[PDB]
Amino acid sequence: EWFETCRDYIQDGHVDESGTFRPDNAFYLRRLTLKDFRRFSLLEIKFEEDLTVIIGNNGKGKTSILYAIAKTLSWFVANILKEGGSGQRLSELTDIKNDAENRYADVSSTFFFGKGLKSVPIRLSRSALGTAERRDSEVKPARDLADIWRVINEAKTINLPTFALYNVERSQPFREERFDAYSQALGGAGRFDHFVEWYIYLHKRTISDIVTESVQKSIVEKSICSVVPSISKIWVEMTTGSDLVKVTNDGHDVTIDQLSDGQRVFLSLVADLARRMVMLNPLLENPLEGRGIVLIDEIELHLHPKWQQEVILNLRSVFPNIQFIITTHSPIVLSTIEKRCIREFDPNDDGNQSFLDSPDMQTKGSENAQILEQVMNVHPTPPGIAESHWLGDFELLLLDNSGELDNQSQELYDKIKTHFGIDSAELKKADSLIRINKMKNKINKIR
Amino acid sequence: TCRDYIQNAFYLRRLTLKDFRRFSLLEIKFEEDLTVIIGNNGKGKTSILYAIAKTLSWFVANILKEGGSGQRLSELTDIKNDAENRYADVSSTFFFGKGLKSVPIRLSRSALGTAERRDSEVKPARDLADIWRVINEAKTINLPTFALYNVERSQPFNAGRREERFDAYSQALGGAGRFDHFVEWYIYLHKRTTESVQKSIVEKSICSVVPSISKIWVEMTTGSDLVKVTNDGHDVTIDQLSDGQRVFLSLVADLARRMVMLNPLLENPLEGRGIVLIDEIELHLHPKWQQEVILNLRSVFPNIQFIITTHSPIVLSTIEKRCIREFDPNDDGNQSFLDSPDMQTKGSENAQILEQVMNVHPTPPGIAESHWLGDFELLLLDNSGELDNQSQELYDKIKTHFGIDSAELKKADSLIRINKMKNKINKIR
Amino acid sequence: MKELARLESPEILDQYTAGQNDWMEIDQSAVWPKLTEMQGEFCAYCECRLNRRHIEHFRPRGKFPALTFIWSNLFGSCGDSKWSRCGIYKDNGAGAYNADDLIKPDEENPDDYLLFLTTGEVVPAIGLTGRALKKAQETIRVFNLNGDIKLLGSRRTAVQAIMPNVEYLYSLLEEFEEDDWNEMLRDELEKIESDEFKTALKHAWTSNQE
Numbered sequence A: 001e002w003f004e005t006c007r008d009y010i011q012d013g014h015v016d017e018s019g020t021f022r023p024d025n026a027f028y029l030r031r032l033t034l035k036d037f038r039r040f041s042l043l044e045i046k047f048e049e050d051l052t053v054i055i056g057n058n059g060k061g062k063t064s065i066l067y068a069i070a071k072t073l074s075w076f077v078a079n080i081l082k083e084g085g086s087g088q089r090l091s092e093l094t095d096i097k098n099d100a101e102n103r104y105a106d107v108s109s110t111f112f113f114g115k116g117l118k119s120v121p122i123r124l125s126r127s128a129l130g131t132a133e134r135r136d137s138e139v140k141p142a143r144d145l146a147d148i149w150r151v152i153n154e155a156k157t158i159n160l161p162t163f164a165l166y167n168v169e170r171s172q173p174f175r176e177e178r179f180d181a182y183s184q185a186l187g188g189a190g191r192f193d194h195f196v197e198w199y200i201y202l203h204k205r206t207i208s209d210i211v212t213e214s215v216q217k218s219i220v221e222k223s224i225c226s227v228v229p230s231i232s233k234i235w236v237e238m239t240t241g242s243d244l245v246k247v248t249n250d251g252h253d254v255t256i257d258q259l260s261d262g263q264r265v266f267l268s269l270v271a272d273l274a275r276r277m278v279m280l281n282p283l284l285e286n287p288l289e290g291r292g293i294v295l296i297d298e299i300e301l302h303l304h305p306k307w308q309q310e311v312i313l314n315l316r317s318v319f320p321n322i323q324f325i326i327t328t329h330s331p332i333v334l335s336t337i338e339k340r341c342i343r344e345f346d347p348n349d350d351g352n353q354s355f356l357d358s359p360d361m362q363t364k365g366s367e368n369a370q371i372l373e374q375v376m377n378v379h380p381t382p383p384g385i386a387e388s389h390w391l392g393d394f395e396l397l398l399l400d401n402s403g404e405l406d407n408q409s410q411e412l413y414d415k416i417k418t419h420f421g422i423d424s425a426e427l428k429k430a431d432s433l434i435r436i437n438k439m440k441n442k443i444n445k446i447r
Numbered sequence B: 001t002c003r004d005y006i007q008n009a010f011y012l013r014r015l016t017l018k019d020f021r022r023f024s025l026l027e028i029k030f031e032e033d034l035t036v037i038i039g040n041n042g043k044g045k046t047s048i049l050y051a052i053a054k055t056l057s058w059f060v061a062n063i064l065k066e067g068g069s070g071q072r073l074s075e076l077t078d079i080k081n082d083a084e085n086r087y088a089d090v091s092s093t094f095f096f097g098k099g100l101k102s103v104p105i106r107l108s109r110s111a112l113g114t115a116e117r118r119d120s121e122v123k124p125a126r127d128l129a130d131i132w133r134v135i136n137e138a139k140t141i142n143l144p145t146f147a148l149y150n151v152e153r154s155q156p157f158n159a160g161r162r163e164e165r166f167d168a169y170s171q172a173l174g175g176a177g178r179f180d181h182f183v184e185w186y187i188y189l190h191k192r193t194t195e196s197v198q199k200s201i202v203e204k205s206i207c208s209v210v211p212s213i214s215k216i217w218v219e220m221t222t223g224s225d226l227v228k229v230t231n232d233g234h235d236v237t238i239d240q241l242s243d244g245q246r247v248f249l250s251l252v253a254d255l256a257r258r259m260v261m262l263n264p265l266l267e268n269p270l271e272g273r274g275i276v277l278i279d280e281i282e283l284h285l286h287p288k289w290q291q292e293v294i295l296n297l298r299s300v301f302p303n304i305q306f307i308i309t310t311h312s313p314i315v316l317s318t319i320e321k322r323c324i325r326e327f328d329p330n331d332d333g334n335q336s337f338l339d340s341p342d343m344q345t346k347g348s349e350n351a352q353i354l355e356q357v358m359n360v361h362p363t364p365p366g367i368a369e370s371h372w373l374g375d376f377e378l379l380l381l382d383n384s385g386e387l388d389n390q391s392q393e394l395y396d397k398i399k400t401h402f403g404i405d406s407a408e409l410k411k412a413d414s415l416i417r418i419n420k421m422k423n424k425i426n427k428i429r
Numbered sequence C: 001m002k003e004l005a006r007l008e009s010p011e012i013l014d015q016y017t018a019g020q021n022d023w024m025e026i027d028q029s030a031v032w033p034k035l036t037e038m039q040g041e042f043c044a045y046c047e048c049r050l051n052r053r054h055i056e057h058f059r060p061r062g063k064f065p066a067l068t069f070i071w072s073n074l075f076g077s078c079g080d081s082k083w084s085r086c087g088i089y090k091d092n093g094a095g096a097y098n099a100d101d102l103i104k105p106d107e108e109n110p111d112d113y114l115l116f117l118t119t120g121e122v123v124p125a126i127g128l129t130g131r132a133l134k135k136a137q138e139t140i141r142v143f144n145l146n147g148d149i150k151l152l153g154s155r156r157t158a159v160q161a162i163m164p165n166v167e168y169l170y171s172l173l174e175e176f177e178e179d180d181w182n183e184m185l186r187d188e189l190e191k192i193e194s195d196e197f198k199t200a201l202k203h204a205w206t207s208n209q210e
């Protein structure tokens, strides 16, 4: 009775969106409040069921947010790994805002899990070293959720949530159990050398051609093919005497060493996520349609702009039901994301904010310079490059002689010609200025 | 002599690479001020910087120790696997003042089992480095500050081997700087307080080059001495800074410390000579910092050569087109030269640089709406420059999606107005 | 920004005076109709459409008490405050502005003090010196007409969107008698009244009348 009710509550069954299974009872982080949490004196944030991108200028805490979300997901991970398991704690020396009279830090996240239990108000707190009073963590509901998950899984195989944190260090240079998918989930995941090792291993396991290892390899290969610019991926052993990885990077058939480093990092991240999600979703036609929360710090790290302009075209299409929390520096990726899925910081902020709001200006499908001019407050031209101001000064010169050419303006026009070139758009602008001002003077003269 | 005409530029001029790491034959000219290499993500550019670092390692080895044999090429990696020659040469020319305008070097390596021991010809570079070492030993003379900084500098964070001069060359090449050595050296300087001016120079350096940081000091708490900065007005430790902030602080502080020990006799030790290689100067940076990295670097180091790779249009928008070196997308057909971009980049639109120098459209083609505006143009010209049902629907879609003040909608309005005036004047004429 | 002709004052203002009452206590709807009469459904100085109705005092209430409740200073603005340009920046981001130095758009013509370049920037009018010149920069600094990167990117993107318009209009000058061409320029300056940054588009299609 009760067990069957719980199992039906977790094993949500609904497939009508062109065959794309969706969970009736979706787990996802609905809100997150930070109080005296390393800069943030008090900061609320909301999230979307599909995607949320946090942008800033290197001092606006973006990896702090992902770190906190990971340190609260660690408790779910721990309590799905053995009852009474301990999760990751806040640091008592760094993670509490230095400028605080309270001297303690709080991370009051809150998760929505299905229509029935619409709130899971967990909270992770720590006091500063030397404070007699010590703040507790309101982890009990997290324990309850992880415990129901673990118990129902033990009594019957259950698709568990997939939690991942792909931080910056996934690029720095550095087996058959399902819960191995939780290993290093909230840190140290998505390394490329780990990935090649694991997948040469998987290719060898199925080399005979007689969760199945073949299914896992095929699913992760399809993930690679579908959410990365490369179109094919194989392991070539049974040629060259060594085991090399080969892709179709840009229509070629090359080794993965020829791939760009950023492409390699993104490849490792995608493969790691696909492997984890096929490990944690055994009862599912497409394991990639599983739930979970994936954090990605600087999704565009080491990727050429041409790759940034395509990264996120396939994250959701291949991972529909997982909440992506990304942070990024690039506007080129923003030219593929709706304003609905974007939160931004305010430059010139002391840290005592109250909420991060979406961009009023639609960033999806917009020019990188416009969504870099308004969203991120970056001029299309460097203010430090005097040449960029030249055209402006040109105007002044014209207006200084009733919009007509003279010695100084002609000298500046010569400078523009010499610097920018003859096909330069700046030169076309300067010619337009000259013509307009000249015949404006002529109108002024004849009337 | 004026310290042998040393205290005259001191920089690299040319680099030839023959059958070396996929470079069948590639000659590169380099600018005395700043060269920037683009086109690759850092595969061939890493090879170029690695070859330059191998070449500089001989200068370091001979300035440090007499007869020092700097790094040699490798018979296993630094030789093109498919080369009838069966040896790899890394030749490079230097320019050091009016006298000795061409100091050559070759690092050669032949496979095992070849009749002639294809051998590096490092005699003249060794001779110049020995001149440096000898004249320095006789009298103190500021010396070059070679360094290398690859993507490995993104790494988490002994008085004898941190305070003594010539420690500036320790692990100076090879990649990630020794920021831990800088931390210890700075704490030692603070304990001592000539050291005062060095401390001040480093402080001003990383305060000016790094936008977020505004101050740096150390608290001498009994039992634990901490290095602190004022990041966005917050008094924090280095462990608290973001990845990009601390990575760039480590780069600049390592470089500044090396220059301060190497250039004790300058009034501004940051204006000493050197050849600093920097892979991906844009690492972990945001557009606003990209738009000022090179300006700040060139401001704090007036007289120094930078060979830096990059893949960001905002970075190129601050560098003269002469300084740029384009790899072709079809590099498989090995090319003997790296031509500068036809278009001027300095002072130009980041969008134009991205579109032409890098072949990246201003709006992504994966998004359907991204094409909408352009389509509208064509449609307007199809119906004799007048609206019909399709163009009206497209205009409504643009207005709904991008907004009412949308630049796209304003440009659509301008297009329709211009076409209507076209038709009106055609009727009138 | 456009000229306004104020009309019959609401009686509620005569019922509230400084010290006796604060602005919050007033019924906004008791004054909204009159506002709609003088500026229609368009914002007074900073020139949105009034989908987000906003009532502002040109002079700050803090420094300038008493005249807060008077009909003369009640206008519209960019929107409901509940940013870095137009109205707000004067008290937060600006420094020690000295009141009368700044140009008030309801007695003095802004064109006599500042003009709009085709680069989207705004500079003091040519030929200004002394205190007349001082008013020009100080209106830029206090209102942060340039320093706000959002403003520079919108003014510039607006003029650049119609710069080809100015090309084709002016290039046809010789082909048509003056009386006909001036009519074309008249319609051209007619529509910029109902568009954002009218003055920016006014100085790109004609001059400031220096």
Ligand SMILES: Nc1ncnc2c1ncn2[C@@H]1O[C@H](COP(=O)(O)OP(=O)(O)OP(=O)(O)O)[C@@H](O)[C@H]1O
Residues within 6 Å of the ligand: A037, A038, A039, A056, A057, A058, A059, A060, A061, A062, A063, A064, A065, A094, A095, A096, A097, A098, A099, A168, A297, A298, A327, B231, B232, B234, B235, B236, B240, B241, B242, B243, B244, B245, B284
């Ligand atoms: N304990 C603290 N007390 C006060 N301020 C802190 C503290 N910890 C961090 N800060 C602030 O947080 C900032 C760094 O936060 P964070 O690393 O998340 O920025 P980010 O650039 O968005 O992240 P990333 O680039 O790694 O993705 C520090 O520069 C510092 O100003």
